[PDB]
Design a protein around this nucleic acid. Structure first.
Ligand SMILES: Nc1nc2c(ncn2[C@H]2C[C@H](O)[C@@H](COP(=O)(O)OP(=O)(O)OP(=O)(O)O)O2)c(=O)[nH]1
Ligand code: SF4
Ligand SMILES: [Mg+2]
Ligand SMILES: [Mg+2]
Lengths: 186, 868
DNA sequence: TCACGCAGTATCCTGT
RNA sequence: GGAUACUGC
């Protein structure tokens, strides 16, 4: 997979969590620790190889007015560890939706976590409207969100965005979301 | 009748005897024409409290202001009628005193008329927050008895005291030879201008064995060296010990090798052989009582020695445990607590000197074990008796005598180390300057010394001191360096006593700056009078300056010179602490605003100086909170010095008390990163000639967490980089050396001692939650699992990284050196040492040098240059 | 019962 | 994000 096409994927396949993280990253060229962990694990899941992930993170962070050597000094170990290269050397699996929901709670200045759970209903409505979702679809997603079934809300998002009446799968992993989107498109 | 005696230590028990302070010391007896131990009990140190009147009567904080003016009579009447009856106070004496105050309690005016109440210490203690209807605050409710005595009688450190009309004791109260009782504190006064008397000193070393069943340490040998005329103001006596006594006890199971009688007969008559540990402890206690030392010195005395001594005394029910101290008591102090306060109480009235604490305070060493201390101070090699061989040594007379002699030699080493550093005279000087008790000074720490210094300073100047308690601000400025290599003279300009001089110049004090209970307060006005903190600071500074003048004397002995240097350092630290306590959360004088201001001013000063240098069209390349490095861009030393002088004067022209001086002329400089550089300091000899001395600041080569091998390599590299050889040749030499190292590792020729890495423990081994990930902790755990002396917080541990076939990360493969020498499956992980110890260091030293890059270095070491 | 301040560099880890 | 070290001023 190519780094350049990653942005393209962010248009369609990326679940809303990864879309938010990528938007923040390209807006500010820097992510707090939680965002770094989540996005790195997701990009590992999609298939970005250690060299590819290292190149992507290097290029993205270098624009943030930091020394090039600082990246290799600090973030290289984290990137390697996400791929089970150092330390205990374990092939850490990508975060599951349950973990993301029950993982570290985001705070001010953070963008990780599940937007359906960590975004206020007004903010979620605004975001859904921004993505040109039909008003009926936005209302249905909001109703699902009020029901505490955020996974069902993401399933509704997938159904509406991919022009499919039924998702046909129980979304329980962001990598599952990306895989289903790739299967439908390609 | 007048009792004149020199006091060394003071002990009080806040719970058993209220209002009694037990001073101990030496008194002169003509019958024996010598000095004997004395214990004076000052009695009836009455509690003193200060009541602050209100401006308007308040109806018990219910009706708020009522408008009735309040006078001292109203406060006295309120105390006599309501408070006294409520809190069960029978008799008291009250007066009025005009006192000043400037501390961190709001609504308390600068100078007010307080009501001072003096009442016995047997009565209950008033609450701190007690508020009535005429007084708004009470000060001094929980003041200790010893503090009251020392501050009221203006006693500062050990000195000569005169007692008028002493009284005898109805029954014995101490193990000393002379006793007296003072019925009032006003009968004790201090007499100045007299020489300190000699004080007995006993250096003790114990050798024990861990009985596995009870997991308790059992004493098998003790040795002690005693000097009866050790001075407190002169050089140590040669030899450092006059007499000695050794005691050896058979274990609970083993028996002597049927020749100990002949062995002791032919060796000497000063060795006492006992059969049960009870007899050993009893004989030791009797000897301590007879000798009566004022100072007991040892290694790890607070941690292991005295704790095990008391534990074994309790287990064996050895009668008369109080002999270990100087006061006769029935109930042993509770075993436990932080540091060694329980141990200190057990030995009440006897100063205890742990060479570990003093070594940590005075000098710097990679490890503070006894072997390393002897190696670094006395420059001698000490043999180590394995813990598992002491038990087996009870099989031959020669081995047992060798063990006892090893204990004797350890005691001699401890005494020699004590003498070398001038621990006792320096402790006396620091105690006299501060005003605390000597045992507290020798227990380590800085907060108590400054606390007592300021307490005395404020009490002497008619102030009410606070009540004892029951990155928070900006610091210095580090200029961004121009990292590189400079082959021309570098002029370093450093300020003299920066922060103390800032306090003096700008008059920063409690009574000058207007604080408000996180913003920098404004500088105090210039129309005020110097406060207390500035004056004290000045005193300390002057002391240091005088010492420096002594150091400047021509044709001075080396050792003495070193001693003077140590003294200087100590004084400097004292002043710095007098600053730092101002921002110490748990300090009695927490004044975070003031400290912030200090730092702020310092920053400003540095900025200004830099600006001035740039206005002189010079180049500034570094500065750490008080210093500036200037690139002279010249090679004529004389001219450089001229420039020094010039700029020096210029800077001084802007300040009154602040001063800047030439802290060194570097022939060459290798500036790597903030607070990491190396240079060749130029010491001028005369006639234009000069010598060069290598100086390093912050490099890994001067850090204890790297393997000695790597350090040496780096040192060589530095010696090559800072020389005057043509660069190409330099590089060549570097390559050669590195290749040599590689070979020496591949063939395993390097001494095992050079493969060790040392690290200290901030907490106990168990508290760390990463017992696996942290290597040193792992090693510590293993040691604690073995059958020897345990390792606790602050004890450095040395470990090696080896191969075992586990295929785990290096952090999990740490092992103790002994373990490597023992097990037949562990071998040194050459790769690791060549890849993460030598290569990093060297690379960081070669970063600004053209022609050397990481890759190349790796290649020269035999590593694969791919992943580098 | 204890314990000086802050600025800075280097190394290593994130499963039940 | 956290943890462990120890230099400087
Ligand atoms: N609190 C505290 N501050 C220190 C300590 N060491 C240095 N400082 C601070 C306060 C000093 O005024 C400032 C300047 O460092 P220096 O090493 O040059 O000492 P100073 O200038 O006071 O005296 P000197 O140059 O040796 O004559 O750094 C310390 O151990 N504790
Ligand atoms: S439900 Fe899962 S995939 Fe969808 S936004 Fe939330 S965390 Fe992301
Ligand atoms: Mg200085
Ligand atoms: Mg960070």
């Amino acid at each position: 997979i190519s780094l350049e096409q990653i942005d393209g994927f962010a248009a369609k396949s990326f679940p809303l969590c990864m879309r938010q993280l990528h938007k923040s990253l390209r807006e500010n060229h820097h992510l707090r620790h939680g965002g770094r962990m989540q996005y790195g694990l997701f990009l590992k899941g999609i298939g970005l190889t250690l060299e590819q992930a290292l190149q992507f993170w290097r290029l993205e962070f270098t624009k943030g007015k930091v020394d090039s050597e600082k990246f290799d000094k600090v973030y290289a170990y984290s990137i390697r560890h996400n791929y089970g290269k150092e330390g205990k050397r374990t092939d850490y699996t990508p975060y599951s939706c349950m973990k993301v929901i029950l993982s570290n709670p985001p705070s001010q200045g953070d963008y990780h976590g599940c937007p359906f759970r960590h975004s206020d209903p007004e903010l979620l409505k605004q975001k859904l409207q921004s993505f040109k979702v039909p008003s009926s679809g936005i209302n249905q997603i909001l109703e699902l969100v009020k029901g505490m079934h955020y996974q069902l809300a993401c399933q509704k998002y997938f159904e509406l965005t991919h022009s499919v009446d039924d998702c046909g799968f129980s979304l329980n992993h962001p990598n599952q979301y990306f895989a289903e989107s790739q299967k439908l498109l390609t | 009748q007048v009792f004149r005696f020199y006091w060394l230590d003071a002990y009080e028990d806040q719970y058993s005897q209220p209002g009694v302070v037990y001073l101990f010391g030496k008194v002169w007896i003509e019958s024996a024409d010598a000095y004997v131990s004395c214990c004076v009990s000052v009695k009836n140190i009455e509690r003193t409290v200060y009541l602050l009147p209100r401006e308007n009567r308040v109806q018990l904080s219910t009706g708020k202001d009522t408008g009735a003016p309040v006078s001292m009579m109203h406060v006295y009447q309120e105390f006599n009628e309501a408070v006294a009856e409520k809190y069960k106070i029978m008799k008291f004496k009250s007066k009025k005193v005009d006192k000043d105050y400037a501390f961190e309690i709001p609504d308390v005016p600068a100078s007010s008329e307080y009501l001072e109440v003096r009442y016995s210490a047997d009565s209950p203690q008033l609450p701190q927050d007690l508020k009535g209807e005429t007084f708004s605050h009470v000060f001094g409710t929980n003041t200790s008895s010893l503090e009251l005595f020392l501050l009221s009688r203006k006693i500062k450190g050990p000195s000569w005291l005169e007692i008028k009309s002493p009284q005898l004791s109805s029954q014995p109260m101490s193990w000393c030879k002379v006793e007296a009782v003072v019925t009032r504190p006003d009968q004790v006064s201090v007499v100045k201008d007299l020489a300190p008397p000699p004080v007995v000193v006993l250096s003790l070393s114990m050798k024990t064995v861990q009985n596995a069943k009870t997991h308790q340490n059992e004493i098998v040998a003790i040795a002690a060296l005693v000097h009866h005329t050790f001075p407190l103001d002169k050089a140590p006596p040669q030899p450092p010990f006059q007499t000695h006594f050794c005691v050896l006890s058979k274990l609970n199971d083993c028996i002597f090798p049927y020749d100990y009688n002949e062995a002791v007969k032919q060796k000497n008559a000063n060795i006492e052989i006992a059969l049960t540990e009870r007899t050993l402890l009893g004989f030791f206690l009797a000897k301590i009582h007879k000798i009566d030392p004022d100072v007991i010195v040892g290694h790890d005395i607070y941690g292991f020695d005295l704790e095990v001594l008391l534990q074994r005394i309790n287990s064996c029910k050895v009668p008369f445990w109080s002999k270990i101290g100087r006061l006769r008591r029935s109930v042993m102090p509770k075993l436990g607590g932080r540091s060694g306060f329980a141990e200190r109480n057990a030995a009440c009235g006897r100063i205890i000197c742990d060479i570990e604490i003093s070594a940590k305070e005075l000098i710097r060493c990679k490890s503070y074990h006894l072997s390393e201390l002897v190696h670094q101070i006395l420059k001698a090699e000490r043999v180590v008796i394995p813990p598992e061989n002491i038990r087996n040594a009870y099989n031959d007379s020669v081995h047992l005598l060798y063990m006892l002699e090893n204990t004797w030699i350890d005691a001699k080493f401890i005494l020699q180390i004590m003498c070398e550093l001038n621990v006792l005279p320096l402790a006396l000087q620091i105690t006299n300057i501060a005003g605390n008790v000597m045992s507290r000074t020798l227990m380590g720490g800085r907060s108590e010394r400054n606390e007592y210094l300021l307490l005395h300073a404020f009490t002497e100047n008619n102030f009410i001191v606070p009540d004892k308690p029951v990155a928070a601000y900006a610091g210095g400025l580090v200029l961004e360096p121009k990292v590189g290599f400079y082959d021309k003279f570098i002029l370093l300009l450093d300020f003299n006593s920066l922060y103390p001089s800032i306090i003096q110049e700008y008059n920063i004090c409690f009574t000058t700056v207007h604080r408000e209970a996180d913003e920098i307060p404004e500088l105090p006005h210039s129309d005020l009078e110097m406060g207390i903190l500035p004056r004290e600071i000045r005193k300390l500074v002057e002391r240091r300056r005088h010492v420096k003048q002594l150091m400047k004397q021509p044709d001075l002995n080396p050792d003495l010179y070193l001693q003077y240097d140590i003294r200087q350092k100590a004084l400097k630290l004292t002043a710095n602490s007098m600053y730092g306590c101002l921002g110490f959360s748990y300090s009695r004088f927490y004044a975070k605003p003031l400290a912030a201001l200090v730092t702020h001013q310092g920053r400003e000063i540095l900025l200004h100086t830099k600006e001035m240098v740039q206005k002189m069209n010079l180049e500034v390349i570094y500065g750490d909170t008080d210093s500036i490095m200037i690139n002279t861009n010249c090679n004529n030393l004389e001219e450089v010095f001229k420039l020094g002088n010039r700029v020096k004067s210029e800077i001084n022209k802007s300040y009154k008390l602040l001063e800047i001086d030439i802290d060194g002329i570097f022939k060459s400089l290798l500036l790597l990163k903030k607070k990491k550089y190396a240079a060749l300091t130029v010491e001028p000899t005369g006639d234009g000639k000069y010598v060069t001395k290598q100086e390093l600041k912050g490099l890994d080569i001067v850090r204890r967490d790297w393997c000695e091998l790597a350090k040496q390599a780096g040192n060589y590299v530095i010696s090559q980089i800072l020389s005057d050889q043509p660069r190409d040749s330099i590089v060549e030499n570097i390559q050669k050396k590195l290749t040599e190292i590689g070979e020496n590792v591949t063939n395993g020729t390097v001494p095992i001692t050079q493969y060790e890495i040392n690290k200290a423990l901030t907490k106990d081994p168990q508290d760390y939650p990463d017992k696996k990930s942290l290597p040193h902790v792992h090693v510590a755990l293993w040691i604690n699992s073995q059958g020897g002396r345990k390792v606790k917080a602050g004890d450095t541990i040395s470990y090696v990284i080896c191969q075992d076939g586990s295929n785990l990360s290096a952090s999990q493969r740490a092992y103790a050196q002994e373990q490597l020498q023992k097990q037949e499956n562990l071998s040194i992980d050459t790769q690791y040492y060549l890849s993460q110890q030598v290569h990093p260091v060297v690379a960081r030293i070669c970063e600004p040098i053209d022609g050397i890059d990481s890759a190349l270095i790796a290649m020269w070491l035999g590593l694969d240059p791919s992943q580098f």
